Amino acid sequence: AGADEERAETARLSSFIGAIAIGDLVKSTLGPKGMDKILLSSGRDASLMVTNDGATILKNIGVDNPAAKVLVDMSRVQDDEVGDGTTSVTVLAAELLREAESLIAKKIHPQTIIAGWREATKAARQALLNSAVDHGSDEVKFRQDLMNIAGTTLSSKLLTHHKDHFTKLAVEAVLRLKGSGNLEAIHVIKKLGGSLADSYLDEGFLLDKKIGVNQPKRIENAKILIANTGMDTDKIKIFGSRVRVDSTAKVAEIEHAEKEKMKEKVERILKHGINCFINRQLIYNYPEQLFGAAGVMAIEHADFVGVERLALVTGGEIASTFDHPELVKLGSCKLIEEVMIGEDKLIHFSGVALGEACTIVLRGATQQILDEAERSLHDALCVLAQTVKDSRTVYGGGCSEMLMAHAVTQLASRTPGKEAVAMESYAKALRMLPTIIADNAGYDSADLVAQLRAAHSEGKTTAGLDMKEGTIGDMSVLGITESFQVKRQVLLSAAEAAEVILRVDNIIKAAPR
């Protein structure tokens, strides 16, 4: 057979190769000095999807025969829990792959060596429950609200000429979001128009449709009715049936029934004094005439997600067949008007008394890079949520790493002769991160390690690699803080994934063709 089977060192190399390739591209992306890449692929690949976020591309493609896609895959969970914020975990994991050659030199029991992960277990556990992340965030928080981590996530990000401002707004959003609400009811999109502003925060929900061109322009003191049951009429669950009659006269009654549906809609809508009908699904037309006549606006097929958020925003109802008006509903009235943004016409539901949910309408010149806003906004949303939840962070800019490197170095000898070697390799691995951030900086790296190691060993924890400074600076001042989450999950994830590669010996796969 053509099945590819590898054992021992050959199998290890497969693992050896995968980590290295990822690191150069990944390494370049990091933080303030990080870079954007464009990936063009043939079908099914439309163009070059440029991505500031490392994770997205990794998730998207399982390009070649080298194993790794699974490795790539895990990081997503870390982002759900946290992120992000900026890719870093993978590179460090990759470097760990490095010593095993010296490990061939170890020429003893590699599995004995794996005792490293327990050490990592230690290493990971210790900063966890040890040392410090973040103090106050009084809340909502005047100032602490942003110009920080949002900008750091954004840092590697291409967007942040304008982007830092975008990232900054995110904290306002988090502030509105705060409470036991969980994460829900926030809607985002971007727009094809220019404004230095680059984006808008809407006090309510933004949607895009028209009931009828006919109908009224804007609605005030709007009575909002959401309907589960679209207006469509006739059939049931017996078609009952395609049909014929004891004279055309009989048909007259059938025509009459539609009127009943119509009349019912007209009768109670008026009592409400009805302004708007949002039907997350197609509507049946007699109301179409009646509404336009009415002073009311329908949104035929207003898709569901925004309907639910709009529930959170408004007061709602229970809708609910046509008994749905009124108090069955709760309609919120600031103003619902269809406006032109630029550009495409959207409907703005606003002055929601609730305030629990809002929207962000991005504005951009336009393009896939505008779609970079698409790359962008998501990144921004997750990090903020984590920061709010954790109530814990860490000094960014290489601070954390340098400290861990110092502490970890103690660890190998803290461990025994065999174990020391493994544990020490783990610690040294810590060193690259100082090399990388600084390297993106444009400053000489070797000096970077030395100065940074001195400042950190000092215990001035806050000192990090200040790219701006070009040396090591006070991260606290800069505001680069890493979520407590990012560091923790990376430590844990890194050990396990690395071991799995190493733990497995005989790698088996069949030839595609």
Swiss-Prot record:
Its EC number is 3.6.1.-. The modification Phosphothreonine is found at residue 248. It catalyses: ATP + H2O = ADP + phosphate + H(+). There is a cross-link at residue 235 (Glycyl lysine isopeptide (Lys-Gly) (interchain with G-Cter in SUMO2)). It is found in: Cytoplasm. InterPro entries: Chap_CCT_beta, Chaperone_TCP-1, Chaperonin_TCP-1_CS, Cpn60/GroEL/TCP-1, GroEL-like_apical_dom_sf, GROEL-like_equatorial_sf, TCP-1-like_intermed_sf, TCP-1_chaperonin. CDD domains: TCP1_beta. ATP binds at residues 31, 85-87, 482, 487. GO terms for cellular component: cell body; chaperonin-containing T-complex; microtubule; zona pellucida receptor complex. Mg(2+) binds at residue 84. One of its GO terms (biological process) is chaperone mediated protein folding independent of cofactor. Coiled coil: none annotated. The modification Phosphoserine is found at residues 47, 247. ADP binds at residues 31, 85-88, 155-156, 397, 482, 487. One of its GO terms (molecular function) is ATP hydrolysis activity. Keywords: Acetylation, ATP-binding, Chaperone, Cytoplasm, Hydrolase, Isopeptide bond, Magnesium, Metal-binding, Nucleotide-binding, Phosphoprotein, Ubl conjugation. The modification N6-acetyllysine is found at residues 141, 168. It comes from the Eukaryota. Pfam families: Cpn60_TCP1 (PF00118). Gene3D superfamilies: GroEL, GroEL-like equatorial domain, TCP-1-like chaperonin intermediate domain. Component of the chaperonin-containing T-complex (TRiC), a hexadecamer composed of two identical back-to-back stacked rings enclosing a protein folding chamber. Each ring is made up of eight different subunits: TCP1/CCT1, CCT2, CCT3, CCT4, CCT5, CCT6A/CCT6, CCT7, CCT8. Interacts with PACRG. Interacts with FLCN. Interacts with DLEC1. Interacts with SVEP1. Component of the chaperonin-containing T-complex (TRiC), a molecular chaperone complex that assists the folding of actin, tubulin and other proteins upon ATP hydrolysis. The TRiC complex mediates the folding of WRAP53/TCAB1, thereby regulating telomere maintenance. As part of the TRiC complex may play a role in the assembly of BBSome, a complex involved in ciliogenesis regulating transports vesicles to the cilia. PANTHER family: CHAPERONIN. Belongs to the TCP-1 chaperonin family. This is T-complex protein 1 subunit beta. It comes from Bos taurus. The lineage of its organism: Eukaryota, Metazoa, Chordata, Craniata, Vertebrata.
